[PDB]
Design an enzyme around this catalytic site. Structure first.
Site, PDB file in Angstrom:
ATOM      1  N   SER A  55       0.801  -1.217   0.000  1.00 51.33           N
ATOM      2  CA  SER A  55       0.000   0.000   0.000  1.00 51.33           C
ATOM      3  C   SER A  55       0.825   1.254   0.000  1.00 51.33           C
ATOM      4  O   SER A  55       0.284   2.336  -0.157  1.00 51.33           O
ATOM      5  CB  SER A  55      -0.961  -0.026   1.190  1.00 51.33           C
ATOM      6  N   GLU A  61      -5.524  -3.941  -6.266  1.00 47.36           N
ATOM      7  CA  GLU A  61      -5.752  -4.569  -4.962  1.00 47.36           C
ATOM      8  C   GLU A  61      -6.774  -5.658  -5.073  1.00 47.36           C
ATOM      9  O   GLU A  61      -7.784  -5.482  -5.771  1.00 47.36           O
ATOM     10  CB  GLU A  61      -6.283  -3.498  -3.960  1.00 47.36           C
ATOM     11  N   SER A  82      -5.829   3.589   4.034  1.00 48.82           N
ATOM     12  CA  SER A  82      -5.296   2.495   3.211  1.00 48.82           C
ATOM     13  C   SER A  82      -6.376   1.770   2.490  1.00 48.82           C
ATOM     14  O   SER A  82      -6.269   0.573   2.210  1.00 48.82           O
ATOM     15  CB  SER A  82      -4.420   1.543   4.012  1.00 48.82           C
ATOM     16  N   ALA A 102       1.293  -3.384   3.987  1.00 46.83           N
ATOM     17  CA  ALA A 102       1.327  -4.750   4.473  1.00 46.83           C
ATOM     18  C   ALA A 102       0.778  -5.656   3.364  1.00 46.83           C
ATOM     19  O   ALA A 102      -0.185  -5.307   2.690  1.00 46.83           O
ATOM     20  CB  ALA A 102       0.423  -4.946   5.718  1.00 46.83           C
ATOM     21  N   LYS A 127       3.232   6.605   4.774  1.00 43.75           N
ATOM     22  CA  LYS A 127       2.322   5.633   4.297  1.00 43.75           C
ATOM     23  C   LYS A 127       2.915   4.259   4.517  1.00 43.75           C
ATOM     24  O   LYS A 127       4.009   3.949   4.012  1.00 43.75           O
ATOM     25  CB  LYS A 127       1.968   5.787   2.790  1.00 43.75           C
ATOM     26  N   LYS A 148       0.116   3.684  -2.820  1.00 45.42           N
ATOM     27  CA  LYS A 148      -1.029   4.575  -2.858  1.00 45.42           C
ATOM     28  C   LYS A 148      -0.647   6.036  -2.828  1.00 45.42           C
ATOM     29  O   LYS A 148      -1.336   6.875  -3.411  1.00 45.42           O
ATOM     30  CB  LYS A 148      -2.007   4.212  -1.710  1.00 45.42           C
TER      31      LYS A 148
END
Ligand SMILES: [Cl-]
Ligand SMILES: [Cl-]
Ligand SMILES: [Cl-]
Ligand SMILES: [Cl-]
Ligand SMILES: [Cl-]
Ligand SMILES: [Mg+2]
Length: 263
Positions: free
Chosen positions: A45, A141, A105, A212, A209, A48
């Site tokens: 993530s 994702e 997230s 995981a 940021k 992002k």
């Protein structure tokens, strides 16, 4: 600092996995410390931030509007989507989606923003255009989190993403308004920040940021510093560990504690 390197090494031993680390001076981009800086790790993530940089570049260019409302459906919802799962019927603006993607997230938010720019390949093309020759997004994702052995998809290097983050948060790649909005999203309070925030002294600045994924993937990118102002960028990644999540988090947090102690 050598004490941080030793903490990186301890993390590798405890976690049974590689750890990549870099620390840049924010103003000059000088490398202050590094360990495996050119090795590849899943971004998870942490991507992002880059995504929202690409969206903001389009805003600056008049190709996107922060207020544009994005309408989506149930089947767009993927795991770990705490904001977007509350807006099926009403939609979310581009601005709202970036806030959710960065501060929460939110995975579906990131997928919708990927649609707004035209997908992973368009994010990768933006990155190449700004001079990042390494970072690549291939999947959306949650599949980008897989962390498969010997898979180059959805990876960066600590050195690449550190430089990219510096480009986004400093200088003129983004307009002042967009740079400040990106910063502000990254600074915003989060529910839990084990990797750097939990132990960070009060009064320090941090724009961060975390990420995981599967197969032990964990990491963080951040701009931070004393007295309210960032002065360094730090990037920490690991992948492959099968230690508990708590152990992964603690080992990474100890790297951060050392960076701060020996600042
Ligand atoms: Cl090294
Ligand atoms: Cl290296
Ligand atoms: Cl409505
Ligand atoms: Cl769109
Ligand atoms: Cl965190
Ligand atoms: Mg705060």
């Amino acid at each position: 600092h050598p004490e941080t390197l030793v903490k990186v090494k301890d993390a590798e031993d405890q976690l049974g996995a590689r750890v990549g680390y870099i620390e840049l001076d924010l103003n000059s981009g000088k490398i202050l410390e590094s360990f495996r800086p050119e090795e590849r790790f899943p971004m998870m993530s942490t991507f992002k931030v880059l995504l929202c940089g690409a969206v903001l570049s389009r805003v600056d260019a008049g190709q996107e509007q922060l207020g544009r409302r994005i309408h989506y459906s149930q089947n767009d919802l993927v795991e770990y989507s705490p904001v977007t799962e509350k807006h099926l019927t009403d939609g979310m603006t581009v601005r709202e989606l970036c806030s959710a993607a960065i501060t929460m997230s939110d995975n579906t938010a990131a997928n919708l923003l990927l649609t707004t720019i035209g997908g992973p390949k368009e994010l990768t093309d933006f990155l190449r255009q700004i001079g990042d020759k390494e970072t690549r997004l291939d999947r959306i994702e949650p599949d980008l989190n897989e962390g498969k052995l010997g898979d180059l998809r959805d990876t960066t290097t600590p050195k690449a993403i550190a430089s990219t983050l510096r480009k986004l948060l400093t200088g003129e790649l983004l307009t002042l308004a967009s740079r400040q909005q990106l910063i502000d999203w990254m600074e915003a309070d989060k529910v839990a920040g084990p990797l750097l925030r939990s132990a960070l002294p009060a009064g320090w600045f941090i724009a961060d940021k975390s990420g995981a994924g599967e197969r032990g993937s964990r990491g963080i990118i951040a701009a931070l510093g004393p007295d309210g102002k960032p002065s360094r960028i730090v990037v920490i990644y690991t992948t492959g560990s099968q230690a508990t999540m708590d152990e992964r988090n603690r080992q990474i947090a100890e790297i951060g504690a050392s960076l701060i102690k020996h600042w």
